Design an enzyme around this catalytic site. Sequence first.
Site, PDB file in Angstrom:
ATOM      1  N   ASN A  91      -1.817  -4.846  -3.660  1.00 41.58           N
ATOM      2  CA  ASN A  91      -2.827  -3.812  -3.816  1.00 41.58           C
ATOM      3  C   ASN A  91      -3.930  -4.269  -4.762  1.00 41.58           C
ATOM      4  O   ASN A  91      -3.686  -5.009  -5.715  1.00 41.58           O
ATOM      5  CB  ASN A  91      -2.198  -2.525  -4.346  1.00 41.58           C
ATOM      6  N   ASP A 122      -5.895  -1.741  -6.093  1.00 45.27           N
ATOM      7  CA  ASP A 122      -6.334  -0.441  -6.591  1.00 45.27           C
ATOM      8  C   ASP A 122      -6.177  -0.244  -8.092  1.00 45.27           C
ATOM      9  O   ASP A 122      -6.614   0.802  -8.592  1.00 45.27           O
ATOM     10  CB  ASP A 122      -5.591   0.673  -5.850  1.00 45.27           C
ATOM     11  N   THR A 176      -0.188   5.431  -1.605  1.00 48.76           N
ATOM     12  CA  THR A 176      -0.684   6.497  -0.745  1.00 48.76           C
ATOM     13  C   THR A 176      -0.482   7.874  -1.374  1.00 48.76           C
ATOM     14  O   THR A 176      -1.334   8.756  -1.225  1.00 48.76           O
ATOM     15  CB  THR A 176      -0.016   6.418   0.624  1.00 48.76           C
ATOM     16  N   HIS A 226      -3.631 -10.348  -3.932  1.00 51.87           N
ATOM     17  CA  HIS A 226      -4.881 -10.175  -3.205  1.00 51.87           C
ATOM     18  C   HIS A 226      -6.045  -9.821  -4.132  1.00 51.87           C
ATOM     19  O   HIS A 226      -7.098  -9.386  -3.658  1.00 51.87           O
ATOM     20  CB  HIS A 226      -4.695  -9.120  -2.116  1.00 51.87           C
ATOM     21  N   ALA A 264       0.811  -1.214   0.000  1.00 54.58           N
ATOM     22  CA  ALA A 264       0.000   0.000   0.000  1.00 54.58           C
ATOM     23  C   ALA A 264       0.843   1.261   0.000  1.00 54.58           C
ATOM     24  O   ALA A 264       0.364   2.317  -0.440  1.00 54.58           O
ATOM     25  CB  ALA A 264      -0.932   0.009   1.206  1.00 54.58           C
ATOM     26  N   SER A 306       5.260  -3.420   4.457  1.00 56.44           N
ATOM     27  CA  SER A 306       5.869  -3.790   5.721  1.00 56.44           C
ATOM     28  C   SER A 306       6.029  -5.294   5.875  1.00 56.44           C
ATOM     29  O   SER A 306       6.484  -5.745   6.929  1.00 56.44           O
ATOM     30  CB  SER A 306       5.049  -3.220   6.882  1.00 56.44           C
ATOM     31  N   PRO A 360      -5.716   5.493   0.265  1.00 55.75           N
ATOM     32  CA  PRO A 360      -5.280   5.193   1.631  1.00 55.75           C
ATOM     33  C   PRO A 360      -4.883   3.733   1.789  1.00 55.75           C
ATOM     34  O   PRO A 360      -5.372   2.848   1.087  1.00 55.75           O
ATOM     35  CB  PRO A 360      -6.518   5.518   2.483  1.00 55.75           C
ATOM     36  N   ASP A 361      -3.994   3.493   2.746  1.00 55.09           N
ATOM     37  CA  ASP A 361      -3.640   2.141   3.163  1.00 55.09           C
ATOM     38  C   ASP A 361      -4.723   1.679   4.120  1.00 55.09           C
ATOM     39  O   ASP A 361      -4.697   2.009   5.306  1.00 55.09           O
ATOM     40  CB  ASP A 361      -2.266   2.126   3.826  1.00 55.09           C
ATOM     41  N   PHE A 362      -5.685   0.908   3.616  1.00 58.91           N
ATOM     42  CA  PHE A 362      -6.816   0.529   4.460  1.00 58.91           C
ATOM     43  C   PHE A 362      -6.434  -0.580   5.438  1.00 58.91           C
ATOM     44  O   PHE A 362      -7.298  -1.313   5.931  1.00 58.91           O
ATOM     45  CB  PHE A 362      -8.012   0.121   3.598  1.00 58.91           C
ATOM     46  N   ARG A 363      -5.133  -0.705   5.716  1.00 59.30           N
ATOM     47  CA  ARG A 363      -4.629  -1.516   6.811  1.00 59.30           C
ATOM     48  C   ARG A 363      -3.907  -0.690   7.864  1.00 59.30           C
ATOM     49  O   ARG A 363      -3.674  -1.190   8.967  1.00 59.30           O
ATOM     50  CB  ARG A 363      -3.697  -2.617   6.279  1.00 59.30           C
TER      51      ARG A 363
END
Length: 295
Positions: free
Chosen positions: A113, A115, A34, A132, A30, A208, A39-42
Site C-alpha cells: 500500500n 496510503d 478498505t 510499492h 489493499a 490476494s 479503495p483498492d484501486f486494483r
Amino acid sequence: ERLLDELTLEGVARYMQSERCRRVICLVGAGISTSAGIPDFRSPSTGLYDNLEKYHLPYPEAIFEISYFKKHPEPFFALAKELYPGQFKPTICHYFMRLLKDKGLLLRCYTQNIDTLERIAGLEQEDLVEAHGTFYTSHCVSASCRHEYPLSWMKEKIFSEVTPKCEDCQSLVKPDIVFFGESLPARFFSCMQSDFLKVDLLLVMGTSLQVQPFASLISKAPLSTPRLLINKEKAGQSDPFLGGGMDFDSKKAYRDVAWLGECDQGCLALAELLGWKKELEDLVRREHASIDAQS
Ligand SMILES: O=C(NCc1ccccn1)c1cccc(Cl)c1
Ligand SMILES: O=C(NCc1ccccn1)c1cccc(Cl)c1
Ligand SMILES: [Zn+2]
C-alpha cells in the site's frame, strides 16, 4: 511433525504465545485499508480506470507510468486531488501490527500500500518495507538535489492545483511511489534476504498475492514457518495453470491456515485468542479519537 498443533486460528495463537514464535513478518495489501475508506484501486468495483477520461490520456496506464509523468505530471496530480482521502484513520488491522510491535514480536511489515496508514498507526521506517513506495514523503526529481517534502506540503500543492516544484531548484517533486516503469526499492530485496532467515510466522493480510515480486515473498519463508492468511478470499495457492504456494486444504497441509473474512474481524478474533482484545480496543479507540479530534 509440525510447529502448529492444528491448522486453525487457535493453533496459530497457541504457536504465537509459545517460546518458538519470536519474530513475525506481516505481508499486507489493499484489503487492510478498505475499511479505512481507502479503495483498492486494483479492484474493478472502485472503478478507477473507468472515470479516467477527464484527464485526456494516450492510454489508461500512462497516468501511472514514470516517463509520461515526467513529461506530463498534471494528470497524475489532478487524479491525486480527486482520490485524496477525506481522513487518514488506520484500521484495527494496522493497530494489530502496532500491537505486534509493542509486544516485541514484529520483525517487519512488507506492504503493497501507498496510503501511509502503517506509519500513522505507529510503525516506524525501520519496521516497514513499502514495496510499492508511499505518498508519505516526496522528492525533487533532480538527482543533484533530491530535496524531501512531507505529505502536508504535497497535499497543499495538490489541492491548490499547483504542480509541485522544488523550492531549491524548481524541478518537479514526485511522491515516493514506485511508478510503473520504476524498479522496486533496493530495500525490498535486501530486507527480504535478511528477514526471511529469521521469521517464525508469516501473517498475510488483505492481499490476494497476485502482484509480483511481492507475492513471491511467501516462498522465501523457511519450510517450517507457519503462514496465516487473513483475507476475504483464499489466495496464494499454486496456480493449476502456470506450472512454494500455500497449501491450506490437502492431506499434505501442515503449516498454512486461512481465515476468510474482513481483515479487521480476523485481527479481532486473533487478538481475542491471544488475550489482547482489550489492549487492541483501547489502542484503536484512543488513536481514532486523537485523529477525529485533530483541530
Ligand atoms: O492511492 C491513491 N490515492 C489515495 C491516497 C492515499 C494516501 C495519500 C494520498 N492519496 C492513488 C492511487 C493511484 C493514483 C493516484 Cl493519483 C492516487
Ligand atoms: O503498484 C505499483 N506501484 C504503485 C502505484 C500506485 C499509484 C500509481 C502508480 N503506482 C508498482 C509499480 C511498479 C512495479 C510494480 Cl510490481 C508495482
Ligand atoms: Zn530540487
